[PDB]
Amino acid sequence: SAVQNKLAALEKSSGGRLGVALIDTADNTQVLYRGDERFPMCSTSKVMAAAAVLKQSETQKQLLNQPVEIKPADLVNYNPIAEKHVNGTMTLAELSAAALQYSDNTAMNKLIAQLGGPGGVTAFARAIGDETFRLDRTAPTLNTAIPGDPRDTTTPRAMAQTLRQLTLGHALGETQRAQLVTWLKGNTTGAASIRAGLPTSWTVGDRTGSGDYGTTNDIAVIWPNGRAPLVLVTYFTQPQQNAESRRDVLASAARIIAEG
Numbered sequence: 001s002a003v004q005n006k007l008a009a010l011e012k013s014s015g016g017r018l019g020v021a022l023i024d025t026a027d028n029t030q031v032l033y034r035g036d037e038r039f040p041m042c043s044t045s046k047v048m049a050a051a052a053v054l055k056q057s058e059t060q061k062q063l064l065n066q067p068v069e070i071k072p073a074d075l076v077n078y079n080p081i082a083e084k085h086v087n088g089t090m091t092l093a094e095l096s097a098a099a100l101q102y103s104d105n106t107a108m109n110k111l112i113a114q115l116g117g118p119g120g121v122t123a124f125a126r127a128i129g130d131e132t133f134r135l136d137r138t139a140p141t142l143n144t145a146i147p148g149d150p151r152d153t154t155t156p157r158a159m160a161q162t163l164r165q166l167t168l169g170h171a172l173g174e175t176q177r178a179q180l181v182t183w184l185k186g187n188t189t190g191a192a193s194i195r196a197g198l199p200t201s202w203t204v205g206d207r208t209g210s211g212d213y214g215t216t217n218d219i220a221v222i223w224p225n226g227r228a229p230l231v232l233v234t235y236f237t238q239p240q241q242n243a244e245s246r247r248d249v250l251a252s253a254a255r256i257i258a259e260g
């Protein structure tokens with residue numbers, strides 16, 4: 001397709017490896033670029049973890065208000081919200097918001113711990129039909145993004161299908177799906193990523209990720225106006241261990257999708 005040549009040229013003009021999956025929920029048509037290659041998910045894995053806790057809350061009705069202690073030993077590499085509540089508590093709802101809206105890695109680990117370890121996150125993926133997602137490590141080591149490492153990876157096609165079901169489908173209960181939508185719409189870390197490539201009149205919720213090898217990720221659900229919503233995954237990683245972030249590549253991929 002014309003879009004695929006447009007993305008291949010963007011990739012060639014980036015020096016790295018680009019993966020894209022778009023779901024047009026008008027006719028279930030899809031645009032895929034390296035859609036079945038594995039990419040390090042990095043902090044985009046927070047969507048699966050937060051959704052898995054939301055699924056638990058369908059049975060445990062008060063689970064989101066459960067306080068969780070934040071201890072000095074819980075702190076890791078990037079802790080913007082959790083560091084404000086050390087020696088106190090945060091609720092699972094507050095931890096979910098911190099993970100999904102500020103990329104707080106301590107919050108992600110509290111979600112993982114609530115699910116019984118990384119295997120509890122992968123389990124929820126399999127329970128909703130995602131046979132590709134795998135979470136193997138806690139934060140921050142899940143973001144090492146080493147070329148060829150199968151750990152903590154998924155494919156663009158699989159993540160796009162999962163994100164649809166979580167945010168627009170019925171993989172979650174209605175109150176839970178709406179809460180995840182509110183959290184994603186309120187993300188603060190995505191202004192330079194997919195959001196920067198789309199028309200200003202489209203509503204977006206997304207969740208970014210980054211890691212070594214200049215790994216720069218964003219997954220988003222997009223509501224243009226008066227038409228069927230979109231689901232877009234843009235993953236990008238580079239050959240150099242110390243490569244710089246390239247959020248502009250995700251913005252440019254979204255623009256290219258949006259054109260077609």
Ligand SMILES: *C(=O)[C@@H](NC(=O)/C(=N/OC)c1csc(N)n1)[C@@H]1N=C(C(=O)O)C(=C)CS1
Pocket residue numbers: 042043044077078103105140141142143144189208209210211212245
């Ligand atoms: C998720 O992607 C998080 N990334 C990391 O913690 C990384 N460290 O892993 C050892 C990392 C290495 S280089 C880099 N840019 N991140 C958090 N995610 C984001 C995000 O939204 O991209 C952050 C900017 C805070 S770290």
